Amino acid sequence: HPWEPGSFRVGLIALKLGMMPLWTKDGQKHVVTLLQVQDCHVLKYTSKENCNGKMATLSVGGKTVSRFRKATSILEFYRELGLPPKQTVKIFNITDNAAIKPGTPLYAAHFRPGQYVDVTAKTIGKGFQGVMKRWGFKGQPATHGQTKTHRRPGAVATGDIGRVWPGTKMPGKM
Amino acid sequence: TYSPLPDDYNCNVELALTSDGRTIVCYHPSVDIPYEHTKPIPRPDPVHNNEETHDQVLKTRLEEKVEHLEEGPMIEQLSKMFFTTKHRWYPHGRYHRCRKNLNPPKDR
Amino acid sequence: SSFSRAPQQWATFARIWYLLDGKMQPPGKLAAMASIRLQGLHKPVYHALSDCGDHVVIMNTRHIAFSGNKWEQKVYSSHTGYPGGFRQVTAAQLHLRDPVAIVKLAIYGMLPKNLHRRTMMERLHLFPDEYIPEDILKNLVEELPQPRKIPKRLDEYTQEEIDAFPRLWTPPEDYRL
Amino acid sequence: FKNKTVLKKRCKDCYLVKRRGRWYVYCKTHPRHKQRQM
Amino acid sequence: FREVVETQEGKTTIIEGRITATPKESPNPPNPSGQCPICRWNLKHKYNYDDVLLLSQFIRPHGGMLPRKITGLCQEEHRKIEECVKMAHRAGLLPNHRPRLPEGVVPKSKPQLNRYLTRWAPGSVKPIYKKGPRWNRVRMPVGSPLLRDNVCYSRTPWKLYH
Amino acid sequence: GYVPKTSLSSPPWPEVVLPDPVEETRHHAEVVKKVNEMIVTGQYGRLFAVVHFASRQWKVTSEDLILIGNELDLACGERIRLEKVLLVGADNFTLLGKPLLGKDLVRVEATVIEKTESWPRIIMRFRKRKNFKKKRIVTTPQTVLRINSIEIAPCL
Amino acid sequence: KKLIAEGPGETVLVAEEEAARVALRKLYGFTENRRPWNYSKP
Amino acid sequence: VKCTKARYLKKKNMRTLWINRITAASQEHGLKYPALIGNLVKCQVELNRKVLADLAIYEPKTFKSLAALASRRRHEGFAAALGDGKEPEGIFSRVVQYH
Amino acid sequence: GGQWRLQQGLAANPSGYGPLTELPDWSYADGRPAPPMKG
Amino acid sequence: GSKAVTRHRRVMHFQRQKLMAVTEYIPPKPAIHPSCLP
RNA sequence: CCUACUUCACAAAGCGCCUUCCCCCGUAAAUGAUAUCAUCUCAACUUAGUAUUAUACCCACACCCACCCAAGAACAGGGUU
Numbered sequence A: 001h002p003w004e005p006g007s008f009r010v011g012l013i014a015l016k017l018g019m020m021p022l023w024t025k026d027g028q029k030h031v032v033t034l035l036q037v038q039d040c041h042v043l044k045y046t047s048k049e050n051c052n053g054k055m056a057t058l059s060v061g062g063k064t065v066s067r068f069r070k071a072t073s074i075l076e077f078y079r080e081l082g083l084p085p086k087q088t089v090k091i092f093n094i095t096d097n098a099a100i101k102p103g104t105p106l107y108a109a110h111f112r113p114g115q116y117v118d119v120t121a122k123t124i125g126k127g128f129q130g131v132m133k134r135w136g137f138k139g140q141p142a143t144h145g146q147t148k149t150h151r152r153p154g155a156v157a158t159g160d161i162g163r164v165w166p167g168t169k170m171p172g173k174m
Numbered sequence B: 001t002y003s004p005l006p007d008d009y010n011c012n013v014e015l016a017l018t019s020d021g022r023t024i025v026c027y028h029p030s031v032d033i034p035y036e037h038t039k040p041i042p043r044p045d046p047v048h049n050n051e052e053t054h055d056q057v058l059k060t061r062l063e064e065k066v067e068h069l070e071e072g073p074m075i076e077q078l079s080k081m082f083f084t085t086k087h088r089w090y091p092h093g094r095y096h097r098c099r100k101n102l103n104p105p106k107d108r
Numbered sequence C: 001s002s003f004s005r006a007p008q009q010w011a012t013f014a015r016i017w018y019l020l021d022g023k024m025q026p027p028g029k030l031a032a033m034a035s036i037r038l039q040g041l042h043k044p045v046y047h048a049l050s051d052c053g054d055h056v057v058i059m060n061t062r063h064i065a066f067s068g069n070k071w072e073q074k075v076y077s078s079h080t081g082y083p084g085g086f087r088q089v090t091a092a093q094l095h096l097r098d099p100v101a102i103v104k105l106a107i108y109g110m111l112p113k114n115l116h117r118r119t120m121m122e123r124l125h126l127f128p129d130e131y132i133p134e135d136i137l138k139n140l141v142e143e144l145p146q147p148r149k150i151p152k153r154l155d156e157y158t159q160e161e162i163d164a165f166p167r168l169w170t171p172p173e174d175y176r177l
Numbered sequence D: 001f002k003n004k005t006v007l008k009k010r011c012k013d014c015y016l017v018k019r020r021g022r023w024y025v026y027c028k029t030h031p032r033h034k035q036r037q038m
Numbered sequence E: 001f002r003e004v005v006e007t008q009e010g011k012t013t014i015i016e017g018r019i020t021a022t023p024k025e026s027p028n029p030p031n032p033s034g035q036c037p038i039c040r041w042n043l044k045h046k047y048n049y050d051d052v053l054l055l056s057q058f059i060r061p062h063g064g065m066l067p068r069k070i071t072g073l074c075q076e077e078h079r080k081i082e083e084c085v086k087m088a089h090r091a092g093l094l095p096n097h098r099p100r101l102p103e104g105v106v107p108k109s110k111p112q113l114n115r116y117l118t119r120w121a122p123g124s125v126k127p128i129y130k131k132g133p134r135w136n137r138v139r140m141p142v143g144s145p146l147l148r149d150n151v152c153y154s155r156t157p158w159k160l161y162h
Numbered sequence F: 001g002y003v004p005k006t007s008l009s010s011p012p013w014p015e016v017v018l019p020d021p022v023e024e025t026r027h028h029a030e031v032v033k034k035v036n037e038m039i040v041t042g043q044y045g046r047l048f049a050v051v052h053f054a055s056r057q058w059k060v061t062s063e064d065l066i067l068i069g070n071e072l073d074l075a076c077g078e079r080i081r082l083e084k085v086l087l088v089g090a091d092n093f094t095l096l097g098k099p100l101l102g103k104d105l106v107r108v109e110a111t112v113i114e115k116t117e118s119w120p121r122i123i124m125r126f127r128k129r130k131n132f133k134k135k136r137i138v139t140t141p142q143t144v145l146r147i148n149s150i151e152i153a154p155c156l
Numbered sequence G: 001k002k003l004i005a006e007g008p009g010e011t012v013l014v015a016e017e018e019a020a021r022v023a024l025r026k027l028y029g030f031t032e033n034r035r036p037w038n039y040s041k042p
Numbered sequence H: 001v002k003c004t005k006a007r008y009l010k011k012k013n014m015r016t017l018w019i020n021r022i023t024a025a026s027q028e029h030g031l032k033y034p035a036l037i038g039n040l041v042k043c044q045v046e047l048n049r050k051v052l053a054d055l056a057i058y059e060p061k062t063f064k065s066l067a068a069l070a071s072r073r074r075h076e077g078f079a080a081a082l083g084d085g086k087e088p089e090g091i092f093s094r095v096v097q098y099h
Numbered sequence I: 001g002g003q004w005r006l007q008q009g010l011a012a013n014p015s016g017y018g019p020l021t022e023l024p025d026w027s028y029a030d031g032r033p034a035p036p037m038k039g
Numbered sequence J: 001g002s003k004a005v006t007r008h009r010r011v012m013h014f015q016r017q018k019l020m021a022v023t024e025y026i027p028p029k030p031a032i033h034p035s036c037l038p
Numbered sequence K: 001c002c003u004a005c006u007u008c009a010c011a012a013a014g015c016g017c018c019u020u021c022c023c024c025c026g027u028a029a030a031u032g033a034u035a036u037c038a039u040c041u042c043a044a045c046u047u048a049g050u051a052u053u054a055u056a057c058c059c060a061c062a063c064c065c066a067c068c069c070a071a072g073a074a075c076a077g078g079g080u081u
Ligand SMILES: [Mg+2]
Pocket: A139, A140, A141, A142
């Protein structure tokens, strides 16, 4: 279909390769990130009315993985589709005029230079972190008499409330 | 004429007072549901297991219905089916299970 | 009758599906009847432990009517657990957001505050318009009558009634209105 | 606008109006006279 | 009645006032000794805001009100009728007595918030955010206090603040 | 005395016209005659009664048991006429007293079947911080009555 | 075209069977409303 | 102590249950509980809430007859309040005198 | 309850001063009257 | 407590409040409003 | 987030780099009755006037001894073609 003003097309799944320097014609330096499209295919397409009636959806798969370490239902799905299994599957909300047949490959030239994109990913996990690193809390002085209280959160609430509010910032997985 | 309550459901009520005036007599025969107010019983005869080769293949196919679900989806299914809440279907401890009367009294 | 005991018990304690209409009704007057028939307080066999509740299907809940200026004065209030989480909306805003929230909240308020309330609400079905699912429609019995009386605006007045109504005053002929 | 519990016209051009559920004294000749009920 | 019609023809505007038909009173009013039309027809305390058949005989073709010197109502019945007609206008009644406007109805506002017995103007009443204590609650005015003397058949008085 | 139709001109309830007294008297006479001939022919079966007894009203039928909470000064096996019948109903008809039905009309019989005591009832009194604690056990007398028959006579 | 008995049930088949049982009880005169046995002496 | 104090509550709660059941049955017949109770008293039929609920559950024909009688007495009371008797003061009126 | 009972002159509480209270509860089946009740 | 004379209206005993509520002035009400009749 | 710089070095960091999107109402104005002028309207009504009936994330029911991991206190999770 031709492109309409209020239309949205599919994205892709890439792999983060690294970062590189880049320079512009005015001499400015910008750091860039390289995203490689390893094996990106459209996996399945749900109709507008079959998910929420709000927008159509396209499922897209990431890089190929081994068939020996996947769920049997996933293996049956990929056998029916006729493609290698993918490490991740992400769902894109699209208009009905942008739907593509499942199994089609998606290439990097889907995006053109002079364009702004959104990149979603699982950030680096730092485990159970103290409040100082987790929330940028200032700690306590180092030598002026403090007793085992250099990185503690300090007070967590007031006395009148008699409890801790749900949104309180405390140490935890980060 | 005059009727205190409509005489089309459950009764045809007439109220009388005896000549002595000391006892009230209530006559109330039952009303039957008329034939014009009923609908015929449906007669479903679904027969779609007959394939042109065999006859006991459908007898084998009759035992093809089987399904298993875990606690979460099974409880959701039961709650949806019986219009109840999920808490009805979780189990109880041995204390409650064993302090329940298994031979309760019977009336009538 | 003579009603062998198991069929007799089943008939006595069977559930009934009632259909109730919105369409200019007061939400609280709808909720009163809905609460009565959700608790089972309309049956001479009622008891709290007998679980003798019935299904109430309220349609057209988007077209309810409020008396007075409750659309602008009635405030529904809630609180997310987090600080700064106090929320207060008017009945108009809540109705535009959700076309069943007002009647649902009224029925929830009128229902008894014990552990049976959530089951009684599970036996409640609300729809904002005339559309109802086919299974529920096949389940429906004995539609309840509307509590409000639809005050019958001017244009639907069967000109015979206009001729019946008298003219209270003769106006001047030299007036412009 | 000045908040008052009692409002009175301070000249002949002041007029009392009932707007947004409140009593206002509006003046076009002296805008000094603009009063709002509290 | 009377009307003004303006005919523009050849850079000449003819302004004419014509007399049209007019409805008279009914032949035998029940109480000819009364002073108001309401008193004459024994309607005192007998009408509500639903009685558009009675209200629309006192109102202009564009939903406005008529003065007492024309209608013949007393001061009390005039206020009762005017408040009842305000409530009828806010209740969606009187569809053909809409305010006149060239093209301003096309941008339709918020959909039909069905309402009745609307006392205040809907666009000028603030939400009750605090509701006060139990012994002094901020109640919600339903109906008009100028109808407190209407005939009551419920054995319980009408509730004006609820 | 004319008022134009409004929402308040006429009472909301429908206008009720009770029947004319003499024709209603004749109708009552014919209804009592029909019920009486049903009684004489025996067009009833398994009727019940409401009987005032021992400060209580009992919905009794034939063959059942009633437990009354005191002694009666009767031997076990004694047959007794239960007076004070205020309602007796069969299928298709019911007779009411004002407040009691006539002696000639109804006849309820009951036999004394068991004279016993109740299970122990505990009566404990306690008040905190007052050393106030008392305890009783009571067993009240009890009589069991089996209703044998409820007869009706044509004297209506 | 005349109703002789009625019966309830969870399914239409069991309701019909109960109605047949009720009809049999009425025809045979063994109902819950029948005249109770008369225990007396002649 | 709870066992001893629970007798009052048992009496009160059983009476409340009877009242609820009678209200349900009367609303099934279109009546209201106060109207039914008051006019049954006015007809000199002295049935208590217990037996009234018993009949509402187990003798629906009898309960419908009772509700019809109460409605008739209520209409007669309305007619009496309208006409001061004149003549017959109602038929299910005319209380029976005792000496 | 009954306040109309008082207007009929009939003991607003129906459990006193009337046949319902003062009449014998029972009698022997052969006809002999019962001994008087204690109340 | 308070003195018999105070500055804050000294809310009353509930029996006194009921007495004042029950002994209020009731103006006469004509059978027909004076304006209606000629 | 780690390509430069810096503490450092198969990492983690800042002193370094990258990204960051709707209103909110108090008044100011048209037509116009009650009160045939006029009147912004707790009169019916027309505007500035409503961001919301928001979109972004995330949403695969059972291979799993064992090994590795940018995943992790344990458990869990990702990979093993
Ligand atoms: Mg430091």
